[PDB]
C-alpha cells in the first residue's frame, strides 16, 4: 500500500504532466497521496495563473465576515458577523492596519504558536465565498474555472443527467482568519490555489481516521452534537494541534505559499488559518473514486448547514433514502 503513514505529499509536475488534470489526480492517488487527505502541487516554472495582480482592487466583497470566537484557546467555535461591503483595495488596507496586521515573528512555527495562543482574543474579517475567478481565460492548464463539472462526472459514471452548476469561489484573508474543521459538501474533493499574498497553514486528518476526529468533536462540543448528528457541517468548530495530539488524533500540517495548489481528498477533514493579507480561489470537483464517498456522506438536516442549489441533485440521486429529511432541513 502506498503512503501507509498518510503523510502529506508534495508534487512537482512537468509542463507536460500539467496538461491533463484528471490524469495527474489519478497519478497522485497511485502514489498514495489521498491517504493524507491533502496534497500540495507546485506548478511547473513555465506556468502562470494570469499576467499580474495589479488590477484587482475594485473587486467587491459584498458581505465581509467578522469571525468572533467563543471558548478556550485550543477548543473554540466562531460565528460570522456580517459587515458592510468593501472593495478588495479597502480590505487590503484594513488587513495591513495596526489593529489587524500580522505581528512580528521569527518563522512560520513562531507564527503558528502565536495563532493558537491568541486567536480567540481577536475578531479578524474574512472575505469568503465570493463567486468568481482570477485565472486568465487563456490559461489552459489547471484553470479552476475550466474544470470538468461534477454534474458531468455523475452523468458519465452513473448515466443520470442532472441540473446544477459548479463555479469557483474567491477568498480574501487577513491574519488570523480561520477555516473551521470540515469535509467538503457531499465529501467532494476541493482544489485551492493561493493567488497572492501571505501563506495559509493547513491541518488535515487522513480520511481513514475521520471518525476519530468526529468522536473527539462530539466530546468537545457536547451541546452542538446533541443539536445535530453532523454538526461539523456547520463549519464553526476549531480544535488545536496540541488538543488533537493530547487525544491521540492522527493529523498532519503544512503551509501553502502563493503560487501553490492544494487538493483536499474525499472525507479529508481540514482546518487552518491565514498568515496575513491574501487571496485564494477554490472549487469542488469529483472523480470516479468520489462516487462511493458521496453515497456515504453525512448530512446536516437541522437547518444550520444550508448549502448550494447543486447539492440537491447529489443527495437526490446518491442518497434517496435521506433526501426527504435533508430537503426539510433546506426549507
Ligand atoms: O481557504 C479557505 O478559507 C478554505 N478553503 C477550503 O476549505 C478548501 O479549499 O477546501
Ligand atoms: Mg478590480
Ligand atoms: Ni474545504
Ligand atoms: Zn446541523
Swiss-Prot record:
Protein family according to the UniProt entry: Belongs to the JHDM3 histone demethylase family.
Binding-site residues, Fe cation: 182, 184, 270
Taxonomic lineage from the root: Eukaryota, Metazoa, Chordata, Craniata, Vertebrata
Record GO cellular component, one term: pericentric heterochromatin
Keyword Transcription: yes
Positions where PolyADP-ribosyl glutamic acid occurs in the chain: 16-17
The EC number(s) this enzyme carries: 1.14.11.66
Any one biological process term the GO annotation gives: positive regulation of chromatin binding
Every JmjN domain range: 8-50
Protein name (record): Lysine-specific demethylase 4D
Entry binding sites for 2-oxoglutarate: 126, 192, 200, 235
Reactions it catalyzes: N(6),N(6),N(6)-trimethyl-L-lysyl(9)-[histone H3] + 2 2-oxoglutarate + 2 O2 = N(6)-methyl-L-lysyl(9)-[histone H3] + 2 formaldehyde + 2 succinate + 2 CO2
Gene: KDM4D
Known cofactor(s): Fe(2+)
Main location: nucleus
Domain called JmjC: residue spans: 136-302
Post-translational modification (record): Ubiquitinated via 'Lys-63'-linked ubiquitin chains. Deubiquitinated by USP14 with the help of TRIM14 leading to stabilization.
Biological role stated in the UniProt entry: Histone demethylase that specifically demethylates 'Lys-9' of histone H3, thereby playing a central role in histone code. Does not demethylate histone H3 'Lys-4', H3 'Lys-27', H3 'Lys-36' nor H4 'Lys-20'. Demethylates both di- and trimethylated H3 'Lys-9' residue, while it has no activity on monomethylated residues. Demethylation of Lys residue generates formaldehyde and succinate.
Keywords carried by this UniProt record: ADP-ribosylation, Chromatin regulator, Dioxygenase, Iron, Metal-binding, Nucleus, Oxidoreductase, Transcription, Transcription regulation, Ubl conjugation, Zinc
Subcellular location: Nucleus
Example of a GO MF term: histone H3K9 demethylase activity
Binding site for Zn(2+): 228, 234, 300, 302
Cofactor binding mode and count: Binds 1 Fe(2+) ion per subunit.
